[PDB]
Design an enzyme around this catalytic site. Structure first.
Site, PDB file in Angstrom:
ATOM      1  N   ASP E  35     -13.346  13.854  16.998  1.00 24.71           N
ATOM      2  CA  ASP E  35     -12.707  12.652  17.549  1.00 24.71           C
ATOM      3  C   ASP E  35     -13.095  12.391  19.011  1.00 24.71           C
ATOM      4  O   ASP E  35     -13.893  13.127  19.580  1.00 24.71           O
ATOM      5  CB  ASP E  35     -11.173  12.696  17.375  1.00 24.71           C
ATOM      6  CG  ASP E  35     -10.489  13.783  18.223  1.00 24.71           C
ATOM      7  OD1 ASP E  35     -10.969  14.124  19.328  1.00 24.71           O
ATOM      8  OD2 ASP E  35      -9.434  14.290  17.781  1.00 24.71           O
ATOM      9  N   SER E  36     -12.484  11.382  19.632  1.00 25.23           N
ATOM     10  CA  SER E  36     -12.930  10.912  20.944  1.00 25.23           C
ATOM     11  C   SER E  36     -12.835  11.958  22.050  1.00 25.23           C
ATOM     12  O   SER E  36     -13.572  11.898  23.028  1.00 25.23           O
ATOM     13  CB  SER E  36     -12.175   9.648  21.357  1.00 25.23           C
ATOM     14  OG  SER E  36     -12.240   8.671  20.336  1.00 25.23           O
TER      15      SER E  36
END
Ligand SMILES: *P(=O)(O)OCC(C)(C)[C@H](O)C(=O)NCCC(=O)NCCSC(=O)C[C@H](O)CCCCCCCCCCC
Ligand SMILES: *P(=O)(O)OCC(C)(C)[C@H](O)C(=O)NCCC(=O)NCCSC(=O)C[C@H](O)CCCCCCCCCCC
Ligand SMILES: *P(=O)(O)OCC(C)(C)[C@H](O)C(=O)NCCC(=O)NCCSC(=O)C[C@H](O)CCCCCCCCCCC
Ligand SMILES: [Cl-]
Lengths: 336, 75, 336, 338, 76, 76
Positions: E35-36
């Site tokens: 994820d980010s």
């Protein structure tokens, strides 16, 4: 209900398999059974085709070797899903012709094939275009105009002097054109500023449920063509939103904000007013948009969850970050 | 000029916005003194600066009462 | 009104004092007068009890020595407070009878003792179970089903194909079943994805006011038994909420979120979609829930208020924390 | 269609007229949109050079602005407040209803004062009292025994529950719900048990409430909104909140139960406020405030870290989450250096 | 015990995947569900274990397992 | 190589994102150069770094114009 072959051609898709297969509806991959068409977007799920009970699957060219059923091949499965879901839509209309319990002012002007639900209230001077549908319990205020093909679900409130373009859709509980939050302060007392601007909504705009869009103070709040706005949003007075912008749920916009075209505002964002956001900007969720955005791209804010015990120390340390900063400078100086 | 009890109790009172009658030695910060989720942590910081010391997290989690605070500071 | 001894029995409370005392209602410990019953949960108010003018106080066995009135002794005064307030409830019903002004489709099925308020609109194929009460101005869409004992306050909107369990309660302005926020991007143009899933609400669910619960895209949005949801919440398409979970006000959830049983989501939290929160998780207020939660416990985010001048310095230092991090590394070197 | 001589308008506004008093003013407009016959105003001196561009027949401004004027000018001390007053004088806003609609459903026990208007398909319950000149918009519901004071007005589709009290000259916008059950539930071994909310909502005089706002009734004692309070859209005012006179609450504020807010406060939009605590008089909380703790001293208070480019934010977030490590390395270096 | 193995371990620990998913051609984002914040955190993890500082311009070019291994190898 | 005035105006320009031709000695950070409440704080911090100095806040609240920023550093 439709034959796969007809479906493929209307979708301008490449038929691979028995075209006489009868499609009765759309379903997810995990739920699909015989009669159902589904689709796949992510190549991660190619194996899952071997467990899917759909009569047909919309996929790409590189997915086709993995197929275990009839398939429709296209460049964009998700856009094709959108189109075939429209073809096979089961959603009813908010209303069917004009209800006898509707209260319609004698000076209202209705186009052809307008529908108006039970107990809806249409004020004086209102104009409804051809094929407009007003759901049960709506209010449409004085001299408001609703363009051809536009539809309101039940219990939508439209104030006076509002203009709505063609083919729009507004879900229940939404309120368009209430007074902006306009007050002058007189030694602590608030003095109301009548909001005599309007709201102008373009064509093909879709607005979710329990969203509020305020009318402007003097000039107008403006929602451009093809904009989509989710539930629980607040669009304050004199906000201007450029064509094709998307606004996810629970966004709060301050007054006189201008947003450009093709923006994506993540849900629960809070946006300061009297400023501008240019074209092609994405704000991720819960964004604290305090300043104008002059360059396109993606912007974010927020410190994400931690275990409560950890967060306590995190928050306490951040709140004393200035003392950390000083201790740092005082230490750099001592070393050098 | 103040005894350790007087110093510790004064810090707690300032952090929790309570009077010096409230600040008995058996007092628990959360139960009796109405502290919140950040107050205990921040209170522990208030001690580290006032006393010019450094309390390990291991030790810090046992300070939950007025008497436990005073008891650590006498050391 | 009720004799205290008769109330004590219904509350399975051990009575200390005069059972012939007439109780007329419930009231706060500071407002209570003769004829009122109140309750104490915080043992700090023990030495305050002499000031209270209630006729009776619900408390624990440990609290008994401080009693300065008739006392009802139980294990859980707060729960006992809930039950006795139910016994002495003054809250009226949203409606009684079936209103002449209500508009009810001929194909709707009503059970026994159904009440429907003024100007409510009931669509075709609707089924209302025994003792269902529909408030004034409600809309209940085509084929929706509301289970026995469930009640809607005024101006609630239920869309089509919605299923609601038994003994539910929904406050005013709430919209159940609106289109999820579903669009496909076609070269910058948004194309609507019909939302043909449903909303399935279980038994004993209570939903607050101006909350929106969207219908699923293909599969269903599901609200488990015994769930409570406060006001102004956005529950997106295909969210699944496990039994007995509580959702406080202003929470925004993205689509396809799964939440386990026995969770508590603090108000104004924002929760990312396409992921799972497991059973027994608490998220404190204004939680920024970006990632899945796989272990039970309490989780938190956010930096709280500071004086504005302090805050400016805090924000500036945080935004430039990378530089602070680097200055720290170099200084770690200079003394190695 | 209003029509007023500029001299008569100046007189009502207590303004010094520089220019032709016979000018006919027909309405208010913005500087960019004003036509002949419109009056406008200017607060920002940056618009001084703009005055030549403006087609208004008159501009409200200060003494210092006057040498820049290129039209009839109304000189006052406070142009923004004068704008408010002249906007009211020339207001074009219609009323929510006029007279009593035949489609309205009004209980025979309801009391209506003089010159009350009630819109189409509105529903008025038993025991309701509506004071003189009250206006109830179309499709409203007003619950049992509720009382709405003289001159108060509801736009369409407002919901007022039972036993609610609203003072005089109030205004409530559409979709707002006043007096729903507070979020009150006792936990019994994991099952929530409903606590009936038998308190009320007491709203003062000259209160204005925006659209899709929810103000819950109290559990036992009452939710209370002071005189002259203004509340914007999509706010949640929980059970037993008390808001002092002349306080402003901007859009989308979430307030927990039993919060007490003092007088003359300004609560910024999208703030979130903890409950069972108190905010004193003359406090401003800026937008998106995370108000966790009581506020005992007047002033401005703020929270939040604003947007950064996503790549930058990722690094900022990761570093903040690891700030305890940073704190430990800093302490570690201090003891080494010394 | 090698650089390749220490890198591959940290990655798996970081991304919550098994040591057999960590193929050399694996993309953190596309294959390993990063994820980010995942990659930033991973980079911080590698910086700590391998005692180096990775500049932001290289870090944004480390999107695969092999690229990570290659970088650490070239930096002690 | 750069004068004090040049160094101060360069930083005002980079921080407020304006052209050097707009950084006039009479310009007000807020009214002319459009500084928000955070911008001015960031501006001061950048001045502290460039000139390796500390600015007591009682002085910092007096730094609201280009000339005032120069004057503090200058002793003018
Ligand atoms: P990385 O990509 O750089 O950063 C990670 C984050 C910031 C967490 C992430 O990318 C993100 O912003 N995700 C979601 C943004 C969003 O608006 N998602 C919703 C899509 S539409 C849908 O779900 C319909 C529904 O009705 C939406 C209602 C509001 C949704 C709430 C947004 C949640 C944002 C998560 C914050 C951590
Ligand atoms: P600590 O316990 O470890 O952490 C401190 C905090 C995070 C402040 C605290 O524990 C907390 O989360 N308190 C309240 C959370 C909550 O949702 N409270 C509501 C109970 S129900 C109620 O009041 C009725 C009302 O209708 C609810 C509306 C939502 C209000 C949410 C306020 C959140 C406050 C957080 C900080 C600003
Ligand atoms: P500095 O001044 O000390 O700090 C900078 C900030 C905090 C950004 C600044 O001073 C500030 O708070 N300006 C006021 C912002 C504001 O509240 N604008 C709205 C006023 S009224 C309005 O437009 C009515 C509308 O109907 C609802 C308002 C929505 C909420 C506004 C969000 C606040 C933005 C904060 C940062 C993202
Ligand atoms: Cl919100």
């Amino acid at each position: 209900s439709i034959r796969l072959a007809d479906l493929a051609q209307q979708l301008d898709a490449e038929l691979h398999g028995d075209g006489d297969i009868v499609i009765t509806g759309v379903a997810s991959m995990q739920s699909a059974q015989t009669g159902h068409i589904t689709f796949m977007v992510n190549p991660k799920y190619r194996e899952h085709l071997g467990l899917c009970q759909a009569s047909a699957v919309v996929m790409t060219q590189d997915d086709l070797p993995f197929a275990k059923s009839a398939a429709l091949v296209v460049k964009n499965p998700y856009l094709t899903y959108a189109r075939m879901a429209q073809i096979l839509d089961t959603t009813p209309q908010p209303a069917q012709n004009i209800a006898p319990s509707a209260v319609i002012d004698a000076t209202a002007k209705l186009g052809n094939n307008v529908s108006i639900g039970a107990n809806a209230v249409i004020e004086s001077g209102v104009e409804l275009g051809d094929n407009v549908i007003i759901g049960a319990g709506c209010f449409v205020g004085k001299n408001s105009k609703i363009g051809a093909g536009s539809r309101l679900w039940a219990n939508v409130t439209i104030y006076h002097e509002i203009q709505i373009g063609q083919n729009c859709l507004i879900q229940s509980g939404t309120v368009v054109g209430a007074d902006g939050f306009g007050y002058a302060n007189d030694r602590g007392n608030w003095v109301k500023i009548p909001q005599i601007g309007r709201v102008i909504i373009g064509d093909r705009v879709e607005i979710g449920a329990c969203t509020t869009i305020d009318r402007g103070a003097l000039d107008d709040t403006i929602i451009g063509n093809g904009v989509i706005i989710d539930n629980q949003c607040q669009i304050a007075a004199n906000v201007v939103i450029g064509d094709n912008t998307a606004v996810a749920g629970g966004v709060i916009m301050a007054g006189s904000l201008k947003i450009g075209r093709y923006c994506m505002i993540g849900g629960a964002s809070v946006i300061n007013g009297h400023m501008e956001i240019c074209d092609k900007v994405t704000v991720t969720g819960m964004g604290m948009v305090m300043r104008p955005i002059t360059e396109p791209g993606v912007y974010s804010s927020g410190i994400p969850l931690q275990p409560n015990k950890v967060w306590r120390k995190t928050a306490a340390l951040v709140m004393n970050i200035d003392d950390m900063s000083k201790r740092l400078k005082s230490l750099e100086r001592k070393v050098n | 000029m103040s005894t350790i009890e007087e110093r510790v109790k004064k810090i707690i009172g300032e952090q929790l916005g309570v009077k010096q009658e409230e600040v008995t030695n058996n007092a628990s910060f959360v139960e009796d003194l109405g502290a919140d989720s950040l107050d205990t942590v921040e209170l522990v910081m208030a001690l580290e600066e006032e006393f010019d010391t450094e309390i390990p997290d291991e030790e810090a989690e046992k300070i939950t009462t007025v008497q436990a605070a005073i008891d650590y500071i006498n050391g």
